[PDB]
Design a protein around this nucleic acid. Structure first.
Lengths: 58, 136, 75, 66, 94, 116
RNA sequence: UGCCUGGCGGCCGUAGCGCGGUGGUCCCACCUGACCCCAUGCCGAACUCAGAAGUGAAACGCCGUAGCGCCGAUGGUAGUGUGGGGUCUCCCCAUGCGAGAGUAGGGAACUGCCAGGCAA
RNA sequence: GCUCAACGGAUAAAAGGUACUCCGGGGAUAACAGGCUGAUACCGCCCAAGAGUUCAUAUCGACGGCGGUGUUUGGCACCU
RNA sequence: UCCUCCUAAAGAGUAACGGAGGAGCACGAAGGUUGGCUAAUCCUGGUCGGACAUCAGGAGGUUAGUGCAAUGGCAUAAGCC
RNA sequence: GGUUCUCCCCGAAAGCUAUUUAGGUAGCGCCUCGUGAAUUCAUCUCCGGGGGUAGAGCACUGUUUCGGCAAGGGGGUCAUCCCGACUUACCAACCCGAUGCAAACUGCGAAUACCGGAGAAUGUUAUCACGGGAGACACACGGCGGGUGCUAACGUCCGUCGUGAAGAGGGAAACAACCCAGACCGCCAGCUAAGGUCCCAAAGUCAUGGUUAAGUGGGAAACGAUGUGGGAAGGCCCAGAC
C-alpha cells in the first residue's frame, strides 16, 4: 500500500450526511486540499464514495 | 357503463401509473390498437370508442376488449371545505401503461380495421397505433 | 366514522445472527409463530423467543415446510 | 340536461345568470351573495308541442308572452 | 438461410446494452447442447426487415460470426413495448 | 398407515427429549420380536442394545413376542447399561401404548437400578 | 464389502407423487383367537394380550420411468443506491447492485451410527 | 365502593342569552377586495351518427376528447 | 380510552375531520395434565330424505376449526374427544 | 409593547408525550459550561443476519375478457295430474384452456436502509454517563417516497435529505427557501465554481461540421398539413416510369 494523492474538487454544503462523514474520514478539509494515504480497498471504497467531487492522482 | 360488480373496498388510493404495460401482444384478434401514451381511461370513454368503432365494422366480426376500469375516482361535491373525509365515488377508470393493447378484432378487412381504429382514436385521450397479431 | 388506530405494539426481532447475548435476552417479539425455538431458546406464553443460555444467535430453517428456527451457538 | 319527465331538455335553451339577491343580512348578502339564478327557458327550442303550447298560451307569471 | 454477420459482445450489462441499443444495434444470445452460451451483438435495423417474414421463426438460420457460421434457430423474441423495435432475441443452437 | 400414525405420537416427547441432552431409551415392538437400545444425547450413535435377534436370549425364551420375553431382555439391556455404568436414562413410550410388553420391559430396567 | 432388513441421525422439495416390473431361507406386513391384562361414548377396526398354519395382493422396500410435481441456468428486462440533466402527472445519462417471470436443459437423490440374515 | 368514557381523572356538586356590550389580543383565524389555482362557469377547437329535400364538412350536431381566459360560484388562507 | 389491518416508503417508530372493522367480556371450565384423534369441500349408493339431515367408499387436501374483530399463527397441533 | 457599554468561544428548535391542553407549560430529543469513564463513536472493506416495499406475479383473498366441454333450467315436442325424453333464437360461469388488475391479495423477491462483529487509515474524543443553565414545543421551501385534493394551488398532512430559519458573496433581469459556494482582517495579486464571453456589461463577432426562415429561439396541447433535413428498405425503373 504505497502513497496515494487525493484532492477535493467541490463543496460540502449540499452534501449527504454519509458523504459529509466520509469526507472527514479522508481528512480532506477545504476544497483543492491535498492529502496522502495508503492504497487499500477500504480507502478505495471511500474514494469510490465521493468520486463525483474528487480528483485522484497516483 | 363497464363497472366492477361485487367489490371489496369502496375507495382506494390514487397510486402512480409508472412502469410499462404487460399485455403487449394481440392475443385474440388479428389486429390490435396498442396505445402510445401513459394515461387514464374512463368507462364512458370506452363506450364512446367501442360503440363508435363497432359501427365501422357494421356488425361484422368480433371485437375483443382488453381493458377494465376497476378503479374508482372519488371527487368532492362543489362548495365543500377541503378536508373531512374522502369524497364520494364519481366513476371508474383504468390505469394504462404505455404499450398496452386495448382492442382486438378479426373477421374484418384490413383497411376497414385500419379505419375503424382511426375513428376509435378520436374518442380516446391517449395516442395509439395500429398493430397486428404478429406471428410468435 | 374512522380513525381509531390502536397502537404500535413494538413488535419485531431484537437480536440477529451473530450477536452474543446473556440468559434471558429476548430474541424476537413475534405475535404469531413466524419462528420457533430450535435449541437453548424458550418459547414464551406470548410465543416470544428468549435465550435460556448465554451465547450467540444463529438463524436456521429446516423441515419440508421450512419453518425458520433459532438456536444458540454456545459462547 | 335539466331533466324533464320524458324529454330531457338539454341545457342551452335554459339560460342561467348569476345576479345579487334582495334583502338584508350584512356584507355577504349585499355584495358576494351571488348565484342568485335567473333562468330563461324559451319555448322556441325543445319541450315538444304539447309542453310548449301550455307554456305560451297559458296565463301565468314565471313564464312570459314569448 | 439468412446470413447474419454478428459480433461477439465485449461486455454485457444494462448500461452497455442501452449504449449500443442507441447505436442502431442490439444484443442477442445463443445456447444449445453442452456448449458454452455466447454473447452475440448485431444490427437491429436490417434484421428487423428479416423477421418481417413468418418463415423467420421456422427456418434453420445461419449466423456467421467471424468465419464461424453457426446453424441456429429462433426460439423467442423480446420486443419494444410500443415502437416497432426489438430488445433481444433468444437463439437456440440448431 | 399404522407406521405414520405411531410416528406423529412418538415425535412429541422425542423432540422434548432431544433438547434435554440425556440418553433416551428407545424401544421398537413387533408382533413377534422386540427391540431395545439407548441413544447418545447427540442422537447420532448408540451405546448399548438388546433384542430378540440375539441368540444370547432367544434360546432362553419360549416365545419371542410375549410379556416374559420383554422382561428377560429388559434386564439384559439394563445390565450392559450397568456394564457401561450409564444411569442417566429417560424412557421413551415411542408411540406404543404403555401397558403391554413395553410395560413389563421397563420393570426389569428399573429393577437393575436405571434412574428413571 | 455387497443384496439387505430393522431402529436412529444429517443433507432437503433434485430430497415427493403417477405407471410398469420386482422381494420374503431371514425380516416385516397381513393373518388366528381372545372367559381371562387391556379396549370401543357400539364394534378384538383401532388398542392390548396369547400365537402364528397361509400369503407376498394390499402394505413396505428396491429398479426402470420425468409421465408429473419440482428445480433452474446464461443473457436480456423491470426496479434501484449515488452524481447530473430533461418535452421533470414521467423518463434519460454516467456508475455500482441487480430481480420476478420466462427459455434451454436438468431433475425421479446423497451420506452416516448400532443390531442381525446371506456367501466369502 | 364514582360508563372519575372530555377515559393522566380541575371540586361530591356547575345550563343558556347579549344587535348597549366592555377590555386585552390576532390577518397565528372568518366577511369585502387583492393574490395562487381553475373544479364550476364562460370561450374556442378535434371527431361524428342522425335530423336536415340530396349531402354529416349549408346548418345544428349528441356520444366523447383536447386546450384558452380569469368576468360565475368556489378551494386555499399569502397581504390588511 | 383501548384492540386489529392499511396508510408506513422490506428494523422499530411515524400524521390527517385519511381508508375499513371491533372491545367496556366470557370460562370452575372453554383451565392444567395424561391418553387417543385430527379435517373442509365434491363424486356415489341409501327409508319417509327430494339440492343439504345421518351413515358407507373414493377423491381431495387444510379453503376446517380455533368463545367474539382483524392480523400473525397452530396438526410435534394452540384444533376435537 | 419596550428592555440601554464592548470583545472573544460554541451554538438550537418549531419534534415526541400528557395536559378544560391547542398562540401556555412540563419531561424527553436537540444547545451550552464543568467532570468522570472506554480504539467508546463516525466513514470504508469483508463477514453473519432478518426482513417484502419497488418490481413482478395470479395457487389462495377479490376482481377481468373470451372460448371448448357441458349440464342445472327454460321457449317448444307435450307430462294434455306426478314419471320419462330431445332440443338449447341461450347464461356458457363451475371443471379445462387462454388474458389483465389490486393500500388493506402473495406459491416469489431487489436496490437502499437497519443490527452485531473483525480490520486499517482518518477525525478538535465527534460515544456514553453525571451535574449546572437553557431556549424551544406556530415552522417555510426545494428534491425524493406517499395520503388527501382536480396526480389543482406559494394548499394541507407524514417519512427522508438539503436550504432558509440563525449565511452573506456569484449566477437565475429583479427573486429568503433553486444552482455554486460557508464572510477572522487587510492588499490597485494569481487560479478557478455555478453561470457566461456582439453591445448595455468583464470575457471568443473563437474553431469544426450539420439544422431552422418561423425573429422560430422568445408562453402552450389534442389535431391538421405536398415545410424541409437526415436514415433503412421497397414498388417501379432507359425491354422507357411520373
Amino acid at each position: 500500500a504505497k502513497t496515494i494523492k487525493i484532492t477535493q474538487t467541490r463543496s460540502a454544503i449540499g452534501r449527504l450526511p454519509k458523504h459529509k462523514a466520509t469526507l472527514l474520514g479522508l481528512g480532506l478539509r477545504r476544497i483543492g486540499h491535498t492529502v496522502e494515504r495508503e492504497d487499500t480497498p477500504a480507502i478505495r471504497g471511500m474514494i469510490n464514495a465521493v468520486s463525483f467531487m474528487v480528483k485522484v492522482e497516483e | 357503463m363497464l363497472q366492477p360488480k361485487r367489490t371489496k373496498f369502496r375507495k382506494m388510493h390514487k397510486g402512480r401509473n409508472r412502469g410499462l404495460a404487460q399485455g403487449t401482444d394481440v392475443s385474440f384478434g388479428s389486429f390490435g390498437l396498442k396505445a402510445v401514451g401513459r394515461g387514464r381511461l374512463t368507462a364512458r370513454q370506452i363506450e364512446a370508442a367501442r360503440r363508435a368503432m363497432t359501427r365501422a365494422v357494421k356488425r361484422q366480426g368480433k371485437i375483443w376488449i382488453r381493458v377494465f376500469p376497476d378503479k374508482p375516482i372519488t371527487e368532492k361535491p362543489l362548495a365543500v371545505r377541503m378536508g373531512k373525509g374522502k369524497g364520494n365515488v364519481e366513476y371508474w377508470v383504468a390505469l394504462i401503461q404505455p404499450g398496452k393493447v386495448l382492442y382486438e378484432m378479426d373477421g374484418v378487412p384490413e383497411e376497414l380495421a385500419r379505419e375503424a381504429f382511426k375513428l376509435a382514436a378520436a374518442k380516446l385521450p391517449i395516442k395509439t397505433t395500429f398493430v397486428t397479431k404478429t406471428v410468435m | 366514522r374512522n380513525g381509531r388506530d390502536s397502537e404500535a405494539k413494538r413488535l419485531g426481532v431484537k437480536r440477529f445472527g451473530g450477536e452474543s447475548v446473556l440468559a434471558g435476552s429476548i430474541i424476537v417479539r413475534q405475535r404469531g409463530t413466524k419462528f420457533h425455538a430450535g435449541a437453548n431458546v424458550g418459547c414464551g406464553r406470548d410465543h416470544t423467543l428468549f435465550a435460556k443460555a448465554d451465547g450467540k444467535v444463529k438463524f436456521e430453517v429446516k423441515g419440508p415446510k421450512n419453518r425458520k428456527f433459532i438456536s444458540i451457538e454456545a459462547e | 340536461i335539466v331533466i324533464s319527465r320524458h324529454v330531457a331538455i338539454p341545457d342551452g335553451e335554459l339560460e342561467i345568470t348569476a345576479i345579487r339577491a334582495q334583502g338584508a343580512g350584512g356584507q355577504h348578502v349585499n355584495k358576494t351573495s351571488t348565484a342568485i339564478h335567473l333562468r330563461f327557458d324559451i319555448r322556441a327550442s325543445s319541450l315538444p308541442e304539447y309542453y310548449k303550447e301550455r307554456l305560451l298560451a297559458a296565463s301565468h307569471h314565471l313564464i312570459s308572452s314569448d | 438461410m439468412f446470413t447474419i454477420n454478428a459480433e461477439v459482445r465485449k461486455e454485457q450489462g444494462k448500461g452497455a446494452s442501452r449504449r449500443l441499443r442507441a447505436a442502431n444495434k442490439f444484443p442477442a444470445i445463443i445456447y444449445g447442447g453442452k456448449e458454452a452460451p455466447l454473447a452475440i451483438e448485431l444490427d437491429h435495423d436490417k434484421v428487423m426487415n428479416m423477421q418481417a417474414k413468418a418463415e423467420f421463426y421456422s427456418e434453420v438460420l445461419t449466423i456467421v460470426v467471424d468465419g464461424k457460421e453457426i446453424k441456429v434457430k429462433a426460439q423467442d423474441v423480446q420486443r419494444h413495448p410500443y415502437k416497432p423495435k426489438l430488445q433481444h432475441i433468444d437463439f437456440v443452437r440448431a | 398407515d399404522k407406521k405414520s400414525a405411531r410416528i406423529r405420537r412418538a415425535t412429541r416427547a422425542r423432540r422434548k427429549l432431544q433438547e434435554l441432552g440425556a440418553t433416551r431409551l428407545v424401544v421398537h415392538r413387533t408382533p413377534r420380536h422386540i427391540y431395545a437400545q439407548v441413544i447418545a444425547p447427540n442422537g447420532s450413535e448408540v451405546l448399548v442394545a438388546a433384542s430378540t435377534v440375539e441368540k444370547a436370549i432367544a434360546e432362553q425364551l419360549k416365545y419371542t413376542g410375549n410379556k416374559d420375553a420383554a422382561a428377560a431382555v429388559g434386564k439384559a439391556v439394563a445390565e450392559r447399561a450397568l456394564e457401561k455404568g450409564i444411569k442417566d436414562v429417560s424412557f421413551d413410550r415411542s408411540g406404543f401404548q404403555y401397558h403391554g410388553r413395553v410395560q413389563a420391559l421397563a420393570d426389569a430396567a428399573r429393577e437393575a437400578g436405571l434412574q428413571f
